[PDB]
C-alpha cells in the first residue's frame, strides 16, 4: 500500500532485530503483520505464554513500541472479559525510536567527554576514587607517593582515560550500524506521517485466525471524555 508504511515497518523490524531479542522480534512482527491483535490472538499465533509475554509487553510498552487499548465489547455469551488490543502508533513509535537513538548517542558522547580527562588515582584498599583536582592535598613531605587520608596506602593509577580510543571505536561501530536508521529517517522527515489510532489500524487488519474471541468492532459509549 503506502511505501511510507513499508518504510516504518522496516524501521520497527530493524530496531527490534538489532536492540531486542528474538521473541520481541516475533511479537513485533506479529503486530506489524496483523494490524490489530488481542492477547488470545498472540497466544494462538505464537503459542506464547502469559508469563513469557509479560516482560515482552512490559518492555515494548516502556519503549513505546506497542500501544495497548483497553476496550471491552459485548459478545453473544456476554462474558465480557477485559481484552486488551495490541496495535502500533506509528508517529509515537518513530518518535520513541528517534528519542532513544539520540539519547544513546548523547550518552556515549558524554561518556567520551568523561573519558577525555586524565587518568586519576585509585585507592584499592578503600576502593576510593581520586581525581587530579582532589589528590593535590594528600601528598607526603617525602614527595614520592600519593597517600590516602584513611588507608594511608600508596595510590595506583586508573586505567581510565587511555580507553578514549576504545570509546571512539565504540562510537564508530555504533554509528555505521545505525546508518540505515538515519537514512530512513531522512526519508521519513521529508514525508508526512498520519496519526493513526485503533480506528485507523482497524482499516488495514489481517485476520489472525478463523474464530476470534475479541470483537474488533468499536463500541462507542456515552459519557466518555477521556
Amino acid at each position: 500500500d503506502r511505501p511510507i508504511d513499508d518504510i516504518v515497518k522496516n524501521l520497527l523490524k530493524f530496531v527490534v532485530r538489532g536492540f531486542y531479542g528474538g521473541s520481541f522480534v516475533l511479537v513485533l512482527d506479529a503486530i506489524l503483520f496483523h494490524s490489530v491483535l488481542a492477547e488470545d490472538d498472540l497466544k494462538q499465533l505464537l503459542s506464547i505464554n502469559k508469563t513469557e509475554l509479560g516482560p515482552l509487553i512490559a518492555r515494548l510498552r516502556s519503549d513505546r513500541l506497542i500501544s495497548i487499548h483497553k476496550q471491552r465489547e459485548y459478545p453473544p455469551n456476554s462474558k465480557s472479559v477485559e481484552r486488551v488490543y495490541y496495535y502500533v502508533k506509528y508517529p509515537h513509535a518513530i518518535d520513541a525510536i528517534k528519542w532513544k537513538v539520540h539519547q544513546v548517542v548523547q550518552r556515549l558522547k558524554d561518556d567520551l567527554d568523561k573519558n577525555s580527562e586524565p587518568n586519576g588515582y585509585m585507592c584499592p584498599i578503600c576502593l576510593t576514587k581520586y581525581t587530579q583536582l582532589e589528590a593535590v592535598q594528600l601528598l607526603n613531605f617525602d614527595r614520592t607517593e600519593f597517600l590516602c587520608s584513611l588507608c594511608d596506602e600508596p595510590l595506583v593509577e586508573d586505567d581510565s582515560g587511555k580507553k578514549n580510543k576504545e570509546k571512539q571505536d565504540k562510537l564508530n561501530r555504533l554509528m555505521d550500524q545505525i546508518q540505515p536508521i538515519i537514512d530512513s529517517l531522512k526519508k521519513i522527515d521529508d514525508s508526512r506521517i498520519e496519526e493513526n489510532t485503533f480506528e485507523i489500524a482497524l482499516a488495514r487488519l489481517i485476520p489472525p485466525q478463523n474464530q476470534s474471541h475479541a470483537a474488533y468492532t468499536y463500541n462507542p459509549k456515552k459519557g466518555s471524555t477521556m
Binding site: 586524565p118 587518568n119 587530579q132 583536582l133 582532589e134 593535590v136 592535598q137 601528598l139 614527595r143 614520592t144 600519593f146
Partner: protein, 171 residues
C-alpha cells in the same frame, strides 16, 4: 591576583584582656590571625591597610562565655586565585608527580599529566628534577603557569597549574 578589599572579622576577645588599653590588644589579636591567613571567601589575606583608623564596632558579650564578640571592619590586600589566570612563579619542589611552583602565598601544583611529553623526571641528578630536549625545570627557577583550577576550603586554597599552553614556561 592581588586585590584590595573590605573585610569584616568576628573576634572573640577574652575577658582577661579587658584593660583600659583593650583597643591595642584587639588590634594585635586582629593582626595575629589575619596576616598570612588563608580564607576561601577572599583568598590569602596578606597585609592590612589604613592602620590609623580601623572601624571597630561595639563588642558583643557572648550569652554563655562572657567574652566580647567584636565586629572589626578593615581594609586589606588579598591574593585570590581564579581558574583561567596566568601567573609567573618559581619552582620550590619537584617530584615525578610534578612540581610545586610558588606564586605569592600559594603553592600551585603542576602535575605530570599537565606538561608536554618532552619533560621527563630524573632522580639520579641532584636535585631530582625535570629535563627536556630544550629546557629544564629545577628548584628556584623562573616559570609561567596557567591556573586550570583552584579548590578553596575554609582555611586552605590549593590550585592546579599547567604549562602545556604555548608561550609559557621559563622566561
Amino acid at each position: 591576583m592581588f586585590f584590595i578589599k573590605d573585610l569584616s572579622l568576628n573576634i572573640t576577645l577574652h575577658p582577661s584582656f579587658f584593660g583600659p588599653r583593650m583597643k591595642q590588644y584587639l588590634k594585635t589579636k586582629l593582626l595575629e590571625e589575619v596576616e598570612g591567613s588563608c580564607t576561601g571567601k577572599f583568598g590569602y589575606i596578606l597585609c592590612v591597610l589604613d592602620y590609623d583608623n580601623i572601624d571597630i564596632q561595639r563588642g558583643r558579650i557572648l550569652p554563655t562565655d562572657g567574652s566580647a564578640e567584636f565586629n572589626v571592619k578593615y581594609r586589606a590586600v588579598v591574593f585570590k586565585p581564579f581558574k583561567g589566570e596566568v601567573v609567573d612563579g618559581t619552582v620550590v619542589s619537584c617530584s615525578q608527580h610534578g612540581f610545586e611552583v610558588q606564586v605569592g602565598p600559594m603553592k600551585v601544583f603542576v602535575t605530570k599529566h599537565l606538561m608536554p611529553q618532552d619533560l621527563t623526571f630524573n632522580a639520579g641528578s641532584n636535585p631530582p628534577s625535570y629535563q627536556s630536549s630544550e629546557d629544564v625545570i629545577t628548584i628556584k627557577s623562573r616559570i609561567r603557569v596557567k591556573i586550570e583550577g583552584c579548590i578553596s576550603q575554609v582555611s586552605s586554597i590549593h590550585a592546579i597549574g599547567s604549562i602545556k599552553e604555548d608561550y609559557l614556561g621559563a622566561i
